[PDB]
Design a protein around this ligand. Structure first.
Ligand SMILES: NCCN1CCOCC1
Length: 330
């Protein structure tokens, strides 16, 4: 079997992408953020603290004939950005673009931090990292992808994110019409529970390619590209007037400047991120300082290939016995 769903940016900056998901019987459609950096399927619900809901569509397990409370099961998660959520757990039927999984753990949020409340366009997250990162206690639960694996034509899912435009998440197949040239595959380490891989280097604009190992994760749930301080300094040195600002919490550049492209290595292949993709607009309304899409990972502890990098490529998340990541130009 296969699944295919459209993902659309939540705003004009591509801060996040939402994908419609059908939960329960009869179906309740929620727009979830597909996250390859986490492994919990959690949704805003009829149980969430009333004051912590601001415009989101809630999942109501009482109106679902296939919903079953997983007795005693609880979950709590904290993301790298200081945001968090927690609650109880249900099992229910979940479908993504025609691909159905019965008995999927659907984590019902009782408490959400303010970061989630203020994003009225995001009804929850669909974790696509490895199931070893799932926070359900005392019995760990499997991701949607792990549960669908047996039924899928091929154990793969593809991410094809648009730049200021809709994109696609495909499950169980590779669309040969969605990319150009060849797919270069690279090894994945699952030791930390992420889609961790090693990039073979970088180039800033039309400069020479620097061969160096950059270990990082393919994370659809992170907006920006977070790279080592050495790389990020070499990039922003090519932008006139760019500087690192402690007040803003990162690199800012004069909005009138034109940004060079950024190339990252995948084996012997090269993925070119256009300079426009690195522009994240004014730091505040009316400001002439703009926020950069390439930031230092020095304070995070891990390099992240977020939406900025992923949206420049067709990305294959191969969940075979030996998992691999594939990249093609599009
Ligand atoms: N809390 C606001 C941060 N969010 C995170 C997800 O994308 C949009 C912006």
């Amino acid at each position: 079997s296969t699944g295919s769903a459209t993902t659309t940016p939540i705003d004009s900056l591509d801060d996040a992408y939402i994908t419609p998901v059908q939960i329960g019987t009869p179906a309740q459609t929620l727009n979830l953020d597909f996250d390859t950096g986490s492994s919990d399927l959690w949704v805003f619900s009829s149980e969430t603290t009333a004051s912590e809901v601001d415009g989101q569509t809630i999942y109501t397990p009482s109106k679902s004939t296939t919903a079953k409370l997983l007795s005693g099961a609880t979950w709590s998660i904290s993301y790298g950005d200081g945001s968090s959520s927690s609650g109880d757990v249900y099992t229910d039927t979940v479908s993504v673009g025609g691909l159905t999984v019965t008995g999927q753990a659907v984590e019902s949020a009782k408490k959400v931090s303010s970061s989630f409340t203020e994003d009225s366009t995001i009804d929850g997250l669909l974790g696509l990292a490895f199931s070893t990162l799932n926070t359900v206690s005392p019995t760990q639960q499997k991701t949607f992808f792990d549960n669908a694996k047996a039924s899928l034509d091929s154990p793969v899912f593809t991410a094809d994110l648009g730049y200021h435009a809709p994109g696609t998440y495909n499950f169980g197949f590779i669309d040969t019409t969605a990319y150009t040239g060849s797919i270069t595959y690279t090894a994945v380490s699952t030791k930390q529970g992420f889609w961790e891989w090693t990039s073979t280097g970088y180039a800033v604009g039309s400069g020479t390619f620097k061969s160096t190992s950059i270990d990082g994760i393919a994370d659809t749930g992170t907006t920006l590209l977070y790279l080592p301080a050495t790389v990020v300094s070499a990039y922003w040195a090519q932008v006139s007037g760019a500087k690192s600002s402690s007040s803003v919490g990162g690199y800012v550049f004069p909005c009138s400047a034109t940004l060079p492209s950024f190339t990252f290595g995948v084996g012997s292949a090269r993925i070119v991120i256009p300079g426009d993709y690195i522009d994240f607009g004014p730091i505040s309304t009316g400001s002439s300082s703009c926020f950069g899409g390439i930031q230092s990972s020095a304070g995070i502890g891990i390099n992240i290939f977020g939406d900025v990098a992923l949206k420049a490529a067709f990305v294959v998340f191969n969940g075979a016995t030996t998992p691999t990541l594939g990249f093609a130009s599009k």
